[PDB]
């Protein structure tokens, strides 16, 4: 009977919307995590730059360039995470 | 010096692989979202 | 990582399947929806 | 429509057109129910 | 401290879940509340 | 409203608009109760 089929479809819609809500929540969590990670990483580069400034105080050019290498790695990771977060935002809006 | 280089290799490989796997899992989750959006059971309601 | 990238390639195949699914004749109705928006947009001028 | 007027107060044309969409749906349902009630009245008089 | 920071990360995940929850269409009504405040604000001028 | 007048005496516009919100709620309830009492009177006369 069409009545039962329609009722069953209506019921299934209830599961589907909950699953989509769960997916949205997962996306929100992922974007939060990547934002936190990139934010902290940005400051790690500044800290290593401060160590590089300590090196600038006297002599240790090797330490300064090591700090610069850390800075390069951190900024590359930050750019990668920025791209990742752009993808996450796009996907989250798509899901919404 | 070999130990320094090896530790750099280990750290970079581990973190890069871990993040790659995490992002691949996120991508497949998004693809599953797209499939679910496409996977609409309109046929059953239409039949009812 | 090659196994993981094969899974990524499977996700890309899913994306290509979705693109092959992208074709829909009903898209014209979406434009009507946009036309409907125009009505409200017209009412936005009407409020003046 | 009152919510749409709130939108008219400042900015949110999107909200106004959303309210207009709700209005369109409600008036379509009202016309359908008017037809249904005409049928019900006719059938009731027939039965009487 | 890493276990504790993992718990902190779980709290950050809760914050991201709340942000994903942040979207609400009812927010327009809040603006109406602000409009209502204006009325009292107008009465503030009226008291003069 | 008397509390709102106290606010009018000095400064607390916030208190005045809060009092106005209370006034709005009370008058809405009063109108609802007026409608209810009209219904009660009609029903009472019907029963009589």
Short mmCIF file of C-alpha atoms in Angstrom, two decimals:
data_model
loop_
_atom_site.label_atom_id
_atom_site.label_comp_id
_atom_site.label_asym_id
_atom_site.label_seq_id
_atom_site.Cartn_x
_atom_site.Cartn_y
_atom_site.Cartn_z
CA UNK A 1 0.00 0.00 0.00
CA UNK A 2 1.29 3.50 -0.80
CA UNK A 3 0.32 4.66 2.70
CA UNK A 4 2.86 2.37 4.38
CA UNK A 5 5.61 3.19 1.87
CA UNK A 6 5.11 6.93 2.37
CA UNK A 7 5.09 6.52 6.15
CA UNK A 8 8.30 4.49 6.01
CA UNK A 9 9.98 7.12 3.83
CA UNK A 10 8.89 9.83 6.27
CA UNK A 11 10.40 7.80 9.11
CA UNK A 12 13.68 7.30 7.23
CA UNK A 13 13.91 11.06 6.67
CA UNK A 14 14.12 11.40 10.46
CA UNK A 15 17.23 9.21 10.56
CA UNK A 16 18.72 11.03 7.57
CA UNK A 17 18.44 14.49 9.11
CA UNK A 18 20.06 13.28 12.34
CA UNK A 19 22.94 11.73 10.38
CA UNK A 20 23.45 15.01 8.53
CA UNK A 21 23.43 16.88 11.85
CA UNK A 22 26.12 14.53 13.15
CA UNK A 23 28.21 15.11 10.03
CA UNK A 24 27.85 18.88 10.44
CA UNK A 25 28.97 18.62 14.07
CA UNK A 26 32.00 16.58 13.01
CA UNK A 27 32.88 19.25 10.46
CA UNK A 28 32.58 21.95 13.13
CA UNK A 29 34.90 20.00 15.42
CA UNK A 30 37.48 19.52 12.66
CA UNK A 31 37.50 23.21 11.73
CA UNK A 32 37.85 24.16 15.39
CA UNK A 33 40.81 21.81 15.80
CA UNK A 34 42.62 23.03 12.69
CA UNK A 35 42.06 26.66 13.71
CA UNK A 36 43.54 25.97 17.15
CA UNK A 37 46.51 24.13 15.65
CA UNK A 38 47.38 26.86 13.15
CA UNK A 39 46.93 29.56 15.79
CA UNK A 40 49.39 27.92 18.18
CA UNK A 41 51.83 27.14 15.37
CA UNK A 42 51.91 30.79 14.31
CA UNK A 43 53.11 31.70 17.81
CA UNK A 44 55.69 28.90 17.88
CA UNK A 45 57.39 30.64 14.96
CA UNK A 46 57.50 33.89 16.92
CA UNK A 47 59.02 32.08 19.90
CA UNK A 48 61.74 30.58 17.72
CA UNK A 49 62.27 34.04 16.25
CA UNK A 50 62.82 35.27 19.80
CA UNK A 51 65.46 32.57 20.22
CA UNK A 52 66.93 33.84 16.95
CA UNK A 53 67.02 37.32 18.47
CA UNK A 54 68.88 35.92 21.47
CA UNK A 55 71.35 34.58 18.91
CA UNK A 56 71.46 38.03 17.31
CA UNK A 57 72.59 39.33 20.70
CA UNK A 58 75.92 37.52 20.40
CA UNK A 59 77.56 35.20 17.92
CA UNK A 60 75.41 32.14 17.32
CA UNK A 61 74.44 32.65 13.70
CA UNK A 62 73.98 28.88 13.55
CA UNK A 63 71.26 29.13 16.20
CA UNK A 64 69.63 31.99 14.28
CA UNK A 65 69.47 30.00 11.05
CA UNK A 66 68.18 26.96 12.94
CA UNK A 67 65.40 29.15 14.33
CA UNK A 68 64.77 30.34 10.78
CA UNK A 69 64.44 26.73 9.64
CA UNK A 70 61.89 26.14 12.40
CA UNK A 71 60.09 29.28 11.22
CA UNK A 72 60.02 28.01 7.64
CA UNK A 73 58.62 24.65 8.71
CA UNK A 74 56.00 26.30 10.92
CA UNK A 75 54.86 28.74 8.23
CA UNK A 76 54.63 25.95 5.65
CA UNK A 77 52.49 23.95 8.08
CA UNK A 78 50.41 27.08 8.73
CA UNK A 79 49.77 27.56 5.01
CA UNK A 80 48.83 23.90 4.65
CA UNK A 81 46.43 24.20 7.59
CA UNK A 82 45.00 27.39 6.09
CA UNK A 83 44.23 25.49 2.89
CA UNK A 84 42.78 22.63 4.93
CA UNK A 85 40.56 25.05 6.87
CA UNK A 86 39.38 26.66 3.64
CA UNK A 87 38.35 23.21 2.43
CA UNK A 88 36.65 22.51 5.76
CA UNK A 89 34.72 25.79 5.63
CA UNK A 90 33.60 25.12 2.06
CA UNK A 91 32.49 21.59 2.92
CA UNK A 92 30.72 22.80 6.07
CA UNK A 93 28.75 25.40 4.12
CA UNK A 94 27.92 22.76 1.51
CA UNK A 95 26.60 20.47 4.23
CA UNK A 96 24.66 23.32 5.85
CA UNK B 1 74.93 14.18 12.75
CA UNK B 2 73.33 10.98 11.43
CA UNK B 3 71.16 10.80 14.55
CA UNK B 4 70.09 14.42 14.12
CA UNK B 5 69.17 13.78 10.49
CA UNK B 6 67.40 10.53 11.34
CA UNK B 7 65.33 12.17 14.07
CA UNK B 8 64.37 14.94 11.65
CA UNK B 9 63.31 12.30 9.12
CA UNK B 10 61.32 10.38 11.73
CA UNK B 11 59.48 13.43 13.06
CA UNK B 12 58.66 14.86 9.64
CA UNK B 13 57.57 11.55 8.11
CA UNK B 14 55.43 10.63 11.12
CA UNK B 15 53.66 13.98 11.38
CA UNK B 16 53.16 14.35 7.61
CA UNK B 17 51.75 10.83 7.26
CA UNK B 18 49.46 11.32 10.25
CA UNK B 19 48.08 14.62 8.95
CA UNK B 20 47.72 13.19 5.44
CA UNK B 21 45.69 10.27 6.80
CA UNK B 22 43.54 12.61 8.89
CA UNK B 23 42.81 14.86 5.92
CA UNK B 24 42.09 11.85 3.70
CA UNK B 25 39.60 10.63 6.30
CA UNK B 26 38.00 14.08 6.35
CA UNK B 27 37.80 14.05 2.55
CA UNK B 28 36.18 10.61 2.50
CA UNK B 29 33.73 11.77 5.16
CA UNK B 30 32.82 14.70 2.91
CA UNK B 31 32.44 12.33 -0.05
CA UNK B 32 30.12 10.18 2.06
CA UNK B 33 28.13 13.33 2.83
CA UNK B 34 27.83 13.98 -0.91
CA UNK B 35 26.76 10.39 -1.53
CA UNK B 36 24.09 10.60 1.17
CA UNK B 37 22.83 13.86 -0.33
CA UNK B 38 22.62 12.18 -3.73
CA UNK B 39 21.28 8.97 -2.22
CA UNK B 40 17.68 10.12 -1.85
CA UNK B 41 15.01 7.43 -1.61
CA UNK B 42 12.35 9.38 -3.49
CA UNK B 43 11.39 6.19 -5.33
CA UNK B 44 9.85 4.53 -2.27
CA UNK B 45 7.73 7.54 -1.30
CA UNK B 46 6.69 7.94 -4.94
CA UNK B 47 5.67 4.27 -4.99
CA UNK B 48 3.61 4.68 -1.82
CA UNK C 1 50.99 6.01 2.21
CA UNK C 2 50.46 4.44 -1.22
CA UNK C 3 47.58 2.39 0.16
CA UNK C 4 46.15 5.57 1.68
CA UNK C 5 46.61 7.42 -1.62
CA UNK C 6 44.82 4.57 -3.40
CA UNK C 7 41.93 5.21 -1.01
CA UNK C 8 42.22 8.90 -1.92
CA UNK C 9 42.03 7.89 -5.59
CA UNK C 10 38.88 5.92 -4.78
CA UNK C 11 37.48 9.13 -3.31
CA UNK C 12 38.44 10.93 -6.53
CA UNK C 13 36.60 8.21 -8.46
CA UNK C 14 33.58 8.91 -6.26
CA UNK C 15 33.93 12.59 -7.16
CA UNK C 16 34.01 11.71 -10.86
CA UNK C 17 30.93 9.54 -10.34
CA UNK C 18 29.18 12.51 -8.72
CA UNK C 19 30.19 14.71 -11.66
CA UNK C 20 28.80 12.13 -14.07
CA UNK C 21 25.69 12.40 -11.87
CA UNK C 22 25.82 16.20 -12.04
CA UNK C 23 23.56 16.32 -15.10
CA UNK C 24 19.98 17.17 -14.13
CA UNK C 25 17.18 18.53 -16.30
CA UNK C 26 15.27 19.79 -13.25
CA UNK C 27 17.82 22.59 -12.84
CA UNK C 28 15.47 24.94 -14.70
CA UNK C 29 13.17 24.90 -11.67
CA UNK C 30 16.00 26.30 -9.55
CA UNK C 31 16.02 29.34 -11.82
CA UNK C 32 12.31 29.75 -11.13
CA UNK C 33 13.20 29.78 -7.44
CA UNK C 34 15.61 32.61 -8.23
CA UNK C 35 12.80 34.33 -10.12
CA UNK C 36 10.71 33.91 -6.99
CA UNK C 37 13.48 35.66 -5.06
CA UNK C 38 13.12 38.54 -7.49
CA UNK C 39 9.53 38.95 -6.32
CA UNK C 40 10.70 39.45 -2.75
CA UNK C 41 13.49 41.64 -4.10
CA UNK C 42 10.81 43.70 -5.83
CA UNK C 43 8.95 43.88 -2.52
CA UNK C 44 12.19 45.22 -1.03
CA UNK C 45 11.83 48.21 -3.35
CA UNK C 46 8.11 48.29 -2.53
CA UNK C 47 8.76 48.80 1.19
CA UNK C 48 10.06 52.28 0.32
CA UNK D 1 4.91 39.30 6.94
CA UNK D 2 5.49 41.04 10.27
CA UNK D 3 8.91 39.39 10.41
CA UNK D 4 9.42 40.69 6.87
CA UNK D 5 8.55 44.16 8.14
CA UNK D 6 11.16 43.77 10.87
CA UNK D 7 13.56 43.02 8.03
CA UNK D 8 12.29 46.12 6.21
CA UNK D 9 13.37 48.09 9.28
CA UNK D 10 17.05 47.42 8.55
CA UNK D 11 19.01 45.48 5.98
CA UNK D 12 17.95 41.84 5.94
CA UNK D 13 16.38 41.60 2.50
CA UNK D 14 17.19 37.89 2.66
CA UNK D 15 14.93 37.56 5.70
CA UNK D 16 12.19 39.50 3.91
CA UNK D 17 12.26 37.22 0.88
CA UNK D 18 12.34 34.16 3.14
CA UNK D 19 9.21 35.48 4.84
CA UNK D 20 7.73 36.01 1.37
CA UNK D 21 8.47 32.37 0.52
CA UNK D 22 6.67 31.31 3.70
CA UNK D 23 3.79 33.55 2.65
CA UNK D 24 3.65 31.94 -0.79
CA UNK D 25 3.61 28.45 0.71
CA UNK D 26 0.92 29.41 3.21
CA UNK D 27 -1.32 31.03 0.60
CA UNK D 28 -0.95 28.04 -1.73
CA UNK D 29 -1.95 25.76 1.14
CA UNK D 30 -4.85 28.10 1.93
CA UNK D 31 -6.11 27.94 -1.65
CA UNK D 32 -5.82 24.14 -1.62
CA UNK D 33 -7.75 24.00 1.64
CA UNK D 34 -10.36 26.37 0.21
CA UNK D 35 -10.87 23.98 -2.69
CA UNK D 36 -11.00 21.05 -0.27
CA UNK D 37 -13.61 22.83 1.86
CA UNK D 38 -15.69 23.61 -1.23
CA UNK D 39 -15.66 19.90 -2.03
CA UNK D 40 -16.56 19.07 1.57
CA UNK D 41 -19.47 21.52 1.56
CA UNK D 42 -20.78 20.13 -1.73
CA UNK D 43 -20.52 16.55 -0.47
CA UNK D 44 -22.15 17.48 2.84
CA UNK D 45 -25.11 19.07 1.08
CA UNK D 46 -25.36 16.03 -1.19
CA UNK D 47 -25.46 13.75 1.86
CA UNK D 48 -28.00 16.00 3.59
CA UNK E 1 50.22 17.06 30.82
CA UNK E 2 49.69 15.56 27.36
CA UNK E 3 46.69 13.63 28.65
CA UNK E 4 45.38 16.85 30.18
CA UNK E 5 45.99 18.72 26.91
CA UNK E 6 44.11 15.97 25.06
CA UNK E 7 41.21 16.71 27.39
CA UNK E 8 41.68 20.39 26.54
CA UNK E 9 41.52 19.44 22.86
CA UNK E 10 38.27 17.61 23.57
CA UNK E 11 36.99 20.87 25.05
CA UNK E 12 38.10 22.65 21.88
CA UNK E 13 36.18 20.05 19.88
CA UNK E 14 33.15 20.86 22.02
CA UNK E 15 33.69 24.53 21.18
CA UNK E 16 33.80 23.69 17.46
CA UNK E 17 30.61 21.66 17.90
CA UNK E 18 28.98 24.69 19.51
CA UNK E 19 30.15 26.87 16.63
CA UNK E 20 28.69 24.39 14.16
CA UNK E 21 25.55 24.77 16.29
CA UNK E 22 25.86 28.57 16.18
CA UNK E 23 23.67 28.83 13.07
CA UNK E 24 20.12 29.83 13.97
CA UNK E 25 17.43 31.34 11.77
CA UNK E 26 15.52 32.65 14.79
CA UNK E 27 18.18 35.33 15.29
CA UNK E 28 15.98 37.81 13.41
CA UNK E 29 13.62 37.83 16.40
CA UNK E 30 16.46 39.08 18.59
CA UNK E 31 16.67 42.14 16.35
CA UNK E 32 12.97 42.71 16.97
CA UNK E 33 13.78 42.66 20.68
CA UNK E 34 16.33 45.38 19.98
CA UNK E 35 13.65 47.25 18.05
CA UNK E 36 11.47 46.89 21.14
CA UNK E 37 14.27 48.49 23.15
CA UNK E 38 14.10 51.42 20.75
CA UNK E 39 10.51 51.97 21.84
CA UNK E 40 11.63 52.38 25.45
CA UNK E 41 14.54 54.45 24.18
CA UNK E 42 11.99 56.65 22.42
CA UNK E 43 10.08 56.88 25.69
CA UNK E 44 13.33 58.05 27.27
CA UNK E 45 13.16 61.08 24.99
CA UNK E 46 9.44 61.32 25.73
CA UNK E 47 10.03 61.76 29.47
CA UNK E 48 11.51 65.18 28.67
CA UNK F 1 5.63 52.35 35.02
CA UNK F 2 6.22 54.02 38.39
CA UNK F 3 9.56 52.22 38.58
CA UNK F 4 10.20 53.53 35.07
CA UNK F 5 9.46 57.03 36.36
CA UNK F 6 11.99 56.49 39.14
CA UNK F 7 14.42 55.65 36.34
CA UNK F 8 13.33 58.83 34.54
CA UNK F 9 14.43 60.71 37.66
CA UNK F 10 18.09 59.88 36.99
CA UNK F 11 20.02 57.88 34.44
CA UNK F 12 18.79 54.30 34.33
CA UNK F 13 17.29 54.17 30.86
CA UNK F 14 17.92 50.42 30.99
CA UNK F 15 15.58 50.16 33.97
CA UNK F 16 12.98 52.26 32.15
CA UNK F 17 13.01 50.01 29.09
CA UNK F 18 12.89 46.92 31.32
CA UNK F 19 9.79 48.37 32.96
CA UNK F 20 8.42 49.00 29.48
CA UNK F 21 9.01 45.34 28.60
CA UNK F 22 7.10 44.33 31.72
CA UNK F 23 4.34 46.71 30.64
CA UNK F 24 4.20 45.15 27.18
CA UNK F 25 3.97 41.64 28.63
CA UNK F 26 1.27 42.70 31.09
CA UNK F 27 -0.83 44.46 28.45
CA UNK F 28 -0.55 41.48 26.09
CA UNK F 29 -1.72 39.21 28.91
CA UNK F 30 -4.52 41.68 29.67
CA UNK F 31 -5.72 41.61 26.06
CA UNK F 32 -5.59 37.81 26.05
CA UNK F 33 -7.61 37.71 29.27
CA UNK F 34 -10.07 40.22 27.81
CA UNK F 35 -10.63 37.89 24.87
CA UNK F 36 -10.94 34.94 27.25
CA UNK F 37 -13.52 36.81 29.35
CA UNK F 38 -15.49 37.72 26.23
CA UNK F 39 -15.62 34.02 25.38
CA UNK F 40 -16.63 33.19 28.95
CA UNK F 41 -19.43 35.77 28.91
CA UNK F 42 -20.72 34.49 25.58
CA UNK F 43 -20.65 30.88 26.79
CA UNK F 44 -22.31 31.85 30.08
CA UNK F 45 -25.16 33.60 28.28
CA UNK F 46 -25.50 30.59 25.97
CA UNK F 47 -25.77 28.29 28.98
CA UNK F 48 -28.24 30.64 30.69
#
